[PDB]
Every structure is written in C-alpha cells, then in structure tokens.
Amino acid sequence: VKDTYTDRLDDWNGIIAGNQYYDSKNDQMAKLNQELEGKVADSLSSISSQADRIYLWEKFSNYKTSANLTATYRKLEEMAKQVTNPSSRYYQDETVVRTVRDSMEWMHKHVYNSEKSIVGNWADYEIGTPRAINNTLSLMKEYFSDEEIKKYTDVIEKFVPDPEHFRKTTDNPFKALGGNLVDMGRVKVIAGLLRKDDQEISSTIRSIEQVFKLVDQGEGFYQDGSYIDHTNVAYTGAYGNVLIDGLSQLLPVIQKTKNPIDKDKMQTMYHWIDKSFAPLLVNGELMDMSRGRSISRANSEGHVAAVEVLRGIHRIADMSEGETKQRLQSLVKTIVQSDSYYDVFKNLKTYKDISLMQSLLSDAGVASVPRTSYLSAFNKMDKTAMYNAEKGFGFGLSLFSSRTLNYEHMNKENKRGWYTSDGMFYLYNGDLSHYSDGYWPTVNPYKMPGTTETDAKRADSDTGKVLPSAFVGTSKLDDANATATMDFTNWNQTLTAHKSWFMLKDKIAFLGSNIQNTSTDTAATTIDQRKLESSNPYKVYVNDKEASLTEQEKDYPETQSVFLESSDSKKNIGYFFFKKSSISMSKALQKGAWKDINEGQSDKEVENEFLTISQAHKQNGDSYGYMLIPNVDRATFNQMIKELESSLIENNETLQSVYDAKQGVWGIVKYDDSVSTISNQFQVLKRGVYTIRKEGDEYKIAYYNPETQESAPDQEVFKKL
C-alpha cells in the first residue's frame, strides 16, 4: 500500500542504495555497480536449490554460527539493490525476484523466526540480520505484500521489542547507548515504517535522542572529546564510527516523520565532529588507538575506517546550511585531498555517497586548505593526539588508567593487543601506508613502540585489565605543547616505570624513571618498531656514522643519537639520547597472518620488514631519556641536538622535566608535593603534570592533577622566583 510510510522508505532507499542517482557514464558509480553485479552473479551461481535443502549457501551453512544468518540475508539485500537498478543486468529479472521472495520464505520457516532463540552472537540476531531484512524489504517493497512484510519482520519484534535495551530475550539484557543505540534506530525505525507502526517509530526516535547528551561518566561522548564504549574502552574510531555513519543515514528520514528531532538537540553532532573525530584523522587515516579490536580486521585498516567517518560528516554537511555546511564540506575536502595513499571511493558504497563526494571535490567554491596544528588531550579516555601542520606529522599517545581498559580482545578479535596502551606511541609521517598493508599481523606484539615490558610469554586467551593507578594524564598548554605521564605497572605486577612524554611543538621527549623488575624475565623499552617500505629505504646513522643493520640484533653502547634518513625528509626520524645510552637495533622480515590475531580473518601469510630499536633495563632504578625529532634532514637534526644539549632538567623517581629554550617552554611531571625549583626561575609545588611558558616576565601555566581530574588555582601549584 502506497502512503507516507512508503514515501519515507523511498527516501531510505535513496540513502542505502541510491539507484535513482545512478549514471552509467559516471566511472566511480559504474565501478560500484560492477562490484554488486559480481556479488549477485556469485550468489546466484552458488545457491542451493532442489528438494528444500539444508542450507542456501555452503560457505554460510552452519546456522549455529550466527554470522551465517547475517551473511545469508546480506546476499538477498544485494539482490534487492540490483533488481531495482535500471542499469543492472538483473533489473526486474524474474529469477532474482523469485529468489529473494522464496529465499525469505525458506529462512523464515527453517532458520530465523520468532520460535528461535539466540545461538552464538546476539548482535547477528538483533542488529546485523534485522538491518539486512529491513533493507531488502524496503528496496523490494513493490514485490511484497504488506502481510508478507509483517510476517518477515515479526521475528525482529521478538528479538528486539524494546528500543531502550538489547539482549531482551536473554538472561542478561543491557541498556543501548552510543553506536549500538543508532543501530537500534536502523532496526526499529525502518521495521516500524515497513509495518506501518507509529508507536514503534516514535518510541524508537525518543530512545535515540539520548545519543545527543554528553556524559560525565560511563559510555558516550564527553566534553573533552573522548568517546567511551563497552563500559570503559576508548572507542571513538569504531563504535563512534557506527554512531555517526548510521545516524547521518537515518536523520533525513527521521526529520520527515511525525516525530522529528529538535534542532537544538542535534547541535551536539557538530561538537562530536570538531572535538572527537577530526583530531583523530591525519592524512586520511583514523588513528588506530581509537579503534579497539577493529585494528585486527584486514578490510578495516586506518584509511578505510576513516571513510566511515568522512561519509558521515559529508551527509551531515548536506543536511546543514550556510556556514556550517560550507565548513564541514571544507573539512572533508581537505582530508580527502591530503590522502595520497587511499582512494576514498573504495569505501563509498552507495550512489548518493559517491555523488556527494564528487560534487564536493570539484566545487571550487568549497575551500580546501591544509589543516592547522592542534593538540587534543582526551583525558576521559587516556589518549592524546597531536598534529604539526608546519612540518607535517601527527603523533598519538595510547595510555590507560584505573578508569579505562588497556585493550579489547572479544569475539576472537585482537588476540595480541596486550601492550597497545602501555604507553604505546604512533608517528604519522609521509609514509601514509605505515600502519596499513598488514602492519597489525606482522608487527611483533611483544615490542610495541614506546612500551616498557618484560619478555614473558603471553597467552592469546588473555583479556584486558585496568591500571592500578589513577596517575595518568595530559596537561595541555596550547595547540603545540603538552605534557603527559603514566604511573605504569605491567600486567602481572612484576615491572614498574614512571613514563612521561613532553610534546614540544616539533618533537616529543620520552623520559622513564624508577624502572624496577621483580621477575627473572628481562626488561626493555622499545624505542621504535617501524614498518619499512622496500621502494624507499632508510640509511641509518648512529652517532652520525652510517650503520649496517642485520636480522641479528647489534649492540650500540654509548649512543648519543640515531638517525633514519629517507630520500623524502617528511619520512625522516631522529632519536637524541640526552645521556649516552646502550641500545640495540635490528632490521628483519616479520611474517604472520591476520588469522593469528583474529580467528575470523584469512590465514594467508603476510610479511613486512621492520626496524626495531630497544634499550635493556638490567638494574632496578634504571632510566631512559630521548627526544624523537621527525621530518628534518640530517644536518638540521645534528644542529638541533646541539641546541638541545642541556634540555633535560631532571629524570628521577619524583621529578621529570624537559626545557625547550627556543620556545621558552617547560614540561614537568611531579610524583610528590615537594618544592621543586626549575631552571633557577620558578617553583612548582604539587604532585601532577605541568606545561609552562615564559613570555618576557610573565608565565602561562597549565596544571593537571590526573587522579582528581582537576586543574588548580595558579598559586597552589606555581611560584615565581
């Protein structure tokens, strides 16, 4: 029956497929059509028929495996997309129309109905499969009766009756928030339209509106830009993606129902984009420290994941107007144009998304100016993101605390993420491919860059933990300078370190003190583990003399510096040791498979070459201290290290500080309330984290107490001499 419900479903069809916008002469659209043609062809050539089978497809045959339900129904959705595309060879095809109709009947009566209970993963029963059923019926609504559409969606109402909770039919239901709550909208708003049910529609939209509230605690978006999901995990870059991606699809539909959402409510979306999402996007890549277990998915490396966010932003731009529209258009445009590695179109999966992106990129009225420098201290999820526009590098610092989980191993994904928040750092430079092309299955998980660890073996079956200490956090002065610390204890309470970081515009100092080990395992800090490009080799220098690295580790006692020199200065990396230090280095081919870190991924062997730099800590009370200096040439690095000769102020069990004399900026971490006199110029008075600038006779002060999560009046913490 044609009415306002099907008008809304027409709009939905325009969003999830966009056949109305298809143009055979548009090369990018023709590529997506060909992909869908091939998928439908494969499905049709593969499908079982004859004598009411045991499965529809063999590759998805075991219905105790819940992923097989969703993958099966997603194949029917693909058929529904093509049967309604005038340019498809399957347009109005009699076999395809009957295949979809009769495939829905077979699954309904044999596999997935109201009489069933969840077996395997609840998310397939309540999200993945219902989304696929909804979209199939919406696209093919002119081939089904209203009674059939009700019949085929009754199962969705059995598993998901309550728009405020998931797992309703289990013995442990949970409250829907965040990305999962947006998915509640894609399930129940669309099912509600298909079944012409006003109460489902209105109740679901009301439930979704809690997504616009910033939170002080628990799951959701925070004022400082952090996003928490799964109780206590930093998650902007996977669950936050689902939130923005899904919500931006639903909103044009919701706003034309009888229950639209107040514009005042939706204003929070622009906060998310500017405060939460944008800082995590560097040269088209979404920072892995925000993506939880999704790093272990071969098809979702960081440039691919970023497109989920970017397509969400671009849809929000399209529903906005004036200066808000223009500025969001400009954000997407500059990010896409900065990405020389990944083709954004490879993850634009509907015709309207392709069309929107094309219009944006060719519209000379939309500005595309390189993004400026920024530094975001996401203290409410224990991450920090930094970007220098002058020199062209990003830096991410991945921590955890008593408030957050270190890593997520769940659903057999991310089995070796053990050390990815133990003070792991990321450097984003002119190698845009660095954390892609199989980084995650080939990196040595025992040597995550920045981390201080023993060499004890770890079990894949382990799960994450919180840190004993609350003394973890970042004090930000401005968009170029900040200081961080982490009162680190390792997973089995055999090793400690006071680890601190001094972000000083164009360089980052790494200081560690109080390094102790009560195990018989050996302790070391990984200075770096950098994935190489065979097309762009590094020439390595130690103390400014060329070194030949091998697979076998070589020791370099009395090292003042290491320099990794590329043909491209924007890939150069220097390490300056404040005090001569004993390090070791190697260059080696490392092999692995995605299946090693995620059971559901391919067992195909992958390999990459890595350069590893490490510093052993054989004695209690040990220390490290060095400056990472990216994106300068060798002569400039050599000059800078002379400038920085006396930049280390202190690195002991109670006080760590570095001074940048060129800027007039100090970073300081105090572990106690003693009076600390600094550079014969001022005193700092309280346990906590500081970044201070001198401008003539005045001081600008940024103090943070990580444990109480508060700053403090200047006079409590600072005294001029």
Side-chain angles (χ1 to χ4, degrees), residues 28 121 419 429 472 669:
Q28 289 305 338
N121 187 358
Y419 301 135
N429 71 0
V472 183
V669 180

Side-chain angles (χ1 to χ4, degrees), residues 241-253:
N241 289 21
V242 170
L243 204 168
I244 193 169
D245 187 31
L247 188 62
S248 66
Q249 287 194 319
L250 286 167
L251 282 175
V253 171

Side-chain angles (χ1 to χ4, degrees), residues 460-628:
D460 296 345
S461 57
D462 279 12
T463 53
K465 306 282 167 275
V466 301
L467 194 70
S469 176
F471 199 67
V472 183
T474 298
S475 192
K476 165 185 182 170
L477 179 67
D478 58 27
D479 273 305
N481 295 287
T483 305
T485 199
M486 180 186 195
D487 178 24
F488 180 68
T489 300
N490 76 338
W491 66 283
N492 62 1
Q493 293 82 221
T494 58
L495 181 146
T496 64
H498 291 350
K499 299 173 73 64
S500 297
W501 300 265
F502 308 76
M503 291 156 273
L504 296 161
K505 186 195 248 177
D506 63 349
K507 58 202 170 294
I508 304 91
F510 292 71
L511 301 186
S513 69
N514 198 230
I515 299 169
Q516 306 166 297
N517 179 11
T518 60
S519 78
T520 49
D521 307 290
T522 59
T525 292
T526 300
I527 292 161
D528 215 334
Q529 189 190 345
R530 198 77 185 155
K531 186 172 130 283
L532 309 179
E533 300 176 272
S534 51
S535 70
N536 205 328
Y538 280 122
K539 182 165 180 115
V540 184
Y541 306 77
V542 178
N543 297 346
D544 202 39
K545 306 175 262 114
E546 199 194 23
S548 317
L549 302 190
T550 49
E551 244 242 64
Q552 184 132 39
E553 183 130 81
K554 284 164 82 156
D555 295 337
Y556 295 89
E558 308 294 344
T559 295
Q560 198 87 76
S561 75
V562 173
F563 191 71
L564 312 186
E565 180 182 67
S566 178
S567 59
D568 182 356
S569 295
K570 298 300 185 70
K571 300 183 185 172
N572 291 355
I573 310 170
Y575 315 83
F576 167 55
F577 298 87
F578 301 108
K579 286 87 202 93
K580 293 177 172 63
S581 304
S582 186
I583 67 165
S584 69
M585 295 196 282
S586 71
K587 178 171 71 130
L589 187 68
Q590 295 180 4
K591 287 173 178 198
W594 288 93
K595 194 174 195 296
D596 298 343
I597 63 170
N598 182 329
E599 247 312 293
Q601 300 284 308
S602 170
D603 68 9
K604 178 159 159 18
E605 203 219 87
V606 180
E607 66 191 42
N608 283 297
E609 196 90 5
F610 288 82
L611 162 15
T612 305
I613 313 180
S614 62
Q615 182 176 325
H617 303 307
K618 274 164 198 159
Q619 298 285 1
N620 294 146
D622 268 355
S623 200
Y624 64 77
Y626 51 95
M627 188 74 84
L628 175 75

Side-chain angles (χ1 to χ4, degrees), residues 132-318:
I133 289 175
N134 285 337
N135 290 353
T136 297
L137 298 174
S138 187
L139 283 160
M140 274 183 77
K141 60 182 160 57
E142 305 188 328
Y143 295 98
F144 285 91
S145 60
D146 288 337
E147 301 53 68
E148 284 174 326
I149 286 165
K150 181 136 290 121
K151 184 224 294 185
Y152 292 135
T153 56
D154 284 339
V155 60
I156 298 174
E157 304 307 319
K158 181 261 166 88
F159 286 114
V160 199
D162 173 11
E164 265 143 278
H165 299 100
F166 283 113
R167 288 207 299 270
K168 238 291 203 291
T169 65
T170 68
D171 272 335
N172 311 100
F174 77 93
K175 179 169 181 57
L177 294 173
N180 291 150
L181 180 62
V182 162
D183 269 340
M184 181 74 71
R186 296 198 292 182
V187 171
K188 291 187 74 64
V189 175
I190 308 310
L193 288 168
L194 283 164
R195 71 215 339 283
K196 302 182 193 293
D197 184 337
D198 295 336
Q199 189 274 330
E200 182 163 22
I201 290 165
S202 62
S203 64
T204 299
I205 286 169
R206 265 70 202 268
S207 182
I208 285 170
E209 286 169 344
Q210 67 202 124
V211 94
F212 298 109
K213 290 174 173 186
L214 263 18
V215 302
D216 209 24
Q217 219 179 242
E219 300 170 343
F221 283 109
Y222 288 71
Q223 63 165 311
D224 76 359
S226 307
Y227 178 87
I228 294 290
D229 218 319
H230 291 172
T231 303
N232 64 353
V233 185
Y235 244 140
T236 317
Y239 286 94
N241 289 21
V242 170
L243 204 168
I244 193 169
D245 187 31
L247 188 62
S248 66
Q249 287 194 319
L250 286 167
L251 282 175
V253 171
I254 289 174
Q255 293 312 79
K256 291 203 172 305
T257 69
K258 129 185 223 75
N259 318 100
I261 298 176
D262 298 349
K263 308 233 199 174
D264 195 34
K265 245 99 139 192
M266 303 174 120
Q267 199 68 190
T268 306
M269 292 191 306
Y270 309 107
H271 192 266
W272 306 340
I273 288 159
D274 297 325
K275 249 293 226 248
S276 296
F277 287 107
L280 296 172
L281 291 162
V282 178
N283 289 318
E285 183 169 4
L286 185 63
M287 290 190 187
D288 287 334
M289 68 181 183
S290 70
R291 308 203 299 112
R293 74 190 200 270
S294 293
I295 62 176
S296 73
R297 291 178 192 171
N299 71 185
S300 300
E301 296 178 317
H303 294 267
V304 181
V307 185
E308 307 178 343
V309 177
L310 291 165
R311 74 193 183 200
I313 294 164
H314 200 346
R315 288 173 206 143
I316 296 312
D318 195 55

Side-chain angles (χ1 to χ4, degrees), residues 48 50-57 60-65 68-69 72-73 101-117 119 125 129 133 151-152 155 159:
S48 287
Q50 233 80 150
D52 248 33
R53 44 247 182 284
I54 78 147
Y55 55 71
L56 287 183
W57 286 275
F60 306 112
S61 48
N62 178 24
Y63 110 90
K64 310 216 296 136
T65 312
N68 290 343
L69 268 71
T72 290
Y73 281 107
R101 285 175 118 283
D102 295 354
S103 278
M104 292 289 286
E105 188 55 17
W106 194 90
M107 290 280 141
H108 156 67
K109 90 160 271 78
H110 282 265
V111 185
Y112 182 75
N113 48 240
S114 295
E115 282 49 77
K116 302 299 175 135
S117 293
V119 180
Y125 279 75
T129 281
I133 289 175
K151 184 224 294 185
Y152 292 135
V155 60
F159 286 114

